[PDB]
């Protein structure tokens, strides 16, 4: 109907049964809206854990990007949705995915002061030396913003990774 919710809205609102019906009726599990967003991106952005799980189980593509090169991972990282980040990482996504701003999942996790997400990303190979468009990396951001626990996590990771310093 004219006022029926889109697949993106069903996913964002946690309407599991209606979403399951819709994706059976039409091939819309990866359908992109006017901003390029998939149902997975809407679910991830709204912290809908059960819907993210359901979409991934049903084969939704977690690697797709919106018109601004937004990814489900970066959206979840920016909001600190640790369990959704874990599911997406378990899928196999690019942990260093760049958007049109030069942002990456780690940079968003650092910006939001989401230490569990920062830890998880680093464990999955996120590179804290990748820079924004203005040339600042994750370490630079953690320092600038005074997020000390985040800074510690990043610095300890780098100390272990670097083989020129013991």
């Amino acid at each position: 109907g004219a006022n029926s919710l889109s697949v993106h809205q069903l996913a964002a609102q946690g309407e599991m049964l209606y979403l399951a019906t819709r994706i059976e009726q039409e091939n819309v599990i990866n359908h992109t809206d006017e901003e390029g967003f998939t149902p997975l991106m809407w679910a991830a952005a709204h912290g809908q854990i059960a819907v993210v799980e359901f979409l991934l189980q049903n084969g939704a593509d977690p690697q797709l990007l919106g018109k601004g090169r937004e990814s489900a991972l970066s959206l979840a990282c920016s909001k600190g949705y640790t369990d959704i980040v874990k599911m997406l990482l378990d899928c196999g996504v690019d942990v260093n995915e760049y958007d049109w701003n030069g942002g990456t999942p780690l940079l968003y996790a650092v910006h939001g002061n989401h230490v569990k997400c920062v830890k998880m990303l680093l464990e999955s190979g996120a590179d804290p030396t990748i820079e924004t468009d203005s040339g600042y990396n994750s370490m630079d951001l953690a320092v600038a913003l005074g997020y000390r626990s985040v800074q510690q996590v990043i610095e300890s990771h780098l100390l272990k990774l670097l083989q020129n310093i013991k």
Binding site: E35, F37, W42, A45, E70, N101, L107, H111, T132
Partner: peptide, 17 residues
């Protein structure tokens, strides 16, 4: 009704715009 909170990533820049 629909949510108007469309997915968005924040501005993460430092220094002046």
């Amino acid at each position: 009704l629909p949510l108007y909170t469309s997915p968005s990533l924040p501005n993460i820049t430092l220094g002046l715009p």
